[PDB]
């Protein structure tokens, strides 16, 4: 008989501990694995695939239309859309990125925001996208917007433009749930010159917008998502 002493914590059950256990089914042989395409190893692998952002959130019931950012022909100087960058809330929240970020407490890294244009091929347009780093207000006019991170996008044969929100930060991690100290800025978009439709054409054209994370990205300290809850256990 070897002398032992038990410490504080004996008998506790910590849902996060990782130890060995007896197998209830001694000697059982599991089914062989066969090959299946698509294996995922890290959630970091999947948040780099871009998905659509319901940017046009202004509706009243969920609709395919809140994915469409409208553009008006012949407007000059004006603003196309605006949003803050609380990736865990608001427009971002239902996107795959938003949806995964919510399983973690802290995030750090660059984001990739792209816009794909869908107007007739014989039209043309020049837009400016601007990222405003924390510390200033959402820009109120392009002059204000153009003094921060921006890209003049020229609509052409190449249909999409990929803007990166480079990680601009004092503190090396931000909270995924919106927090002030930790806030990330604003994203706005304005006409640089203006949309022009060809003859025989009319109305609004739309941009689709996507979001995905750069390879830069870090997420840490897992927790429970506000995105799902329940009141009684389900049954069959």
């Amino acid at each position: 008989g070897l002398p032992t002493t038990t410490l504080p914590g004996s008998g506790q059950f910590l849902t996060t501990d990782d130890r060995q256990s007896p197998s209830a089914l001694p000697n059982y042989e599991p089914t062989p694995r066969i090959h299946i395409p698509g294996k995922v190893h890290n959630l970091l692998e999947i948040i780099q695939v871009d998905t659509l952002i319901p940017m046009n959130n202004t509706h009243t019931k969920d609709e395919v239309n809140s994915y469409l950012i409208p553009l008006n022909a012949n407007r000059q100087n004006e603003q196309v859309f605006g949003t803050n960058l609380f990736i865990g809330d608001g427009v971002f929240k239902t996107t795959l990125l938003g949806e995964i970020v919510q399983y973690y407490t802290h995030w750090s890294g660059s984001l990739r925001f792209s816009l794909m244009y869908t107007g007739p091929a014989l039209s043309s347009a020049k837009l400016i996208l601007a990222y405003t780093p924390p510390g200033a207000r959402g820009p109120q006019d392009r002059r204000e917007a153009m003094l921060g991170t921006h890209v003049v996008w020229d609509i052409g044969l190449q249909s999409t433009i990929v803007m990166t929100i480079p990680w601009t930060s004092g503190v090396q991690f931000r909270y995924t749930d919106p927090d002030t100290y930790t806030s990330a800025g604003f994203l706005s978009c304005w006409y640089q010159t203006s949309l022009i439709l060809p003859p025989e054409t009319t109305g609004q054209v739309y941009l689709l917008s996507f979001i995905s994370a750069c390879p830069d990205f870090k997420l840490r300290l897992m927790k429970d998502t506000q995105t799902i809850s329940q009141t009684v256990a389900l049954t069959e």
């Binding site: 698509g38 794909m116 869908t118 014989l122 249909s159 025989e200 054409t201 009319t202 054209v205």
Partner: protein, 255 residues
């Protein structure tokens, strides 16, 4: 002078040419291949009809109009009646296959509109009734007709609400599945190569569909002034590397 843009796919006794492609997607970066022995379980030698089943079948055409919500086809169902592919299907106990899907929609440089073409492995549909109402067989086996998301709820059928992918997930995130867009201004076809994806090496072709192909208008169709307000969309699909096993009497399936 090769462009990403022009392409030719020859499979069996049938060929497709596109002069306005946008590359092609190969699901999960894997190309269809036959079933290796190391992965095999059933001891039966399989049948590989080759060129008589691995050719291109063009399903009947759809009509995109400003009110369209989107269409959904299931595989191998959509092909249950195409030539010898279909016969083999009803006659063997088990079968396995990959596909090349080519979705076509051309317009002019004055039109606008953008379709999402996506392949969803194991797309289990939801009942519009809620609770634990099931979706009857016939409803998930529309055949070449596919399911028309702008048709009405029916009884025992699935829900046809587009912002929810027919299953409780948001349209916006379908982009995590192999997919390609058809943006009239860019593109006129979409091509996806689908490798066989299952948790068993070979399965039944009639009790289980392993992918749904979905074509969904996202930026509404907008035709030039006084143009007819609609465009046809055509889907052509070719089984590839097909194998059938466990031949016998010929399945009888509901309806």
């Amino acid at each position: 002078g090769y462009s990403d843009r022009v392409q030719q796919i020859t499979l069996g006794n049938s060929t497709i040419t596109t002069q306005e492609a946008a590359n092609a997607v190969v699901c999960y970066a894997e190309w269809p291949e036959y079933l290796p022995d190391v992965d095999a379980s059933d001891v039966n030698k399989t049948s590989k009809p080759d060129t008589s089943v691995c050719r291109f079948y063009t399903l009947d055409s759809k009509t995109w109009t400003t009110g369209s919500k989107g269409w959904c086809w299931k595989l191998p169902d959509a092909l249950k009646d195409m030539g010898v592919f279909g016969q083999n299907m009803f006659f063997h106990s088990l079968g396995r296959s990959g596909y090349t899907v080519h979705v076509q929609c051309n317009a002019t440089k004055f039109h606008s509109g953008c379709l999402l073409v996506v392949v969803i492995p194991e797309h289990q549909l939801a009942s519009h009734e809620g609770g634990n109402v099931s979706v009857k067989y016939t409803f998930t086996h529309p055949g070449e007709r596919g399911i028309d998301l702008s048709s009405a709820n029916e009884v025992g059928g699935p829900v046809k609400d587009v912002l929810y992918n027919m299953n409780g997930t948001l349209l916006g995130n379908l982009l995590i599945f192999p997919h390609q867009f058809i943006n009239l201004r860019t593109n006129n076809t979409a091509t996806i190569v689908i490798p066989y994806i299952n948790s068993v090496p070979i399965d039944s072709m009639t009790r289980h569909n392993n992918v749904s192909l979905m074509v969904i208008p996202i930026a509404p169709l907008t035709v030039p002034t006084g143009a007819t307000p609609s465009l046809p969309i055509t889907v052509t699909i070719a089984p590839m590397c097909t194998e059938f096993s466990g031949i016998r009497s010929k399945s009888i399936v509901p309806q």
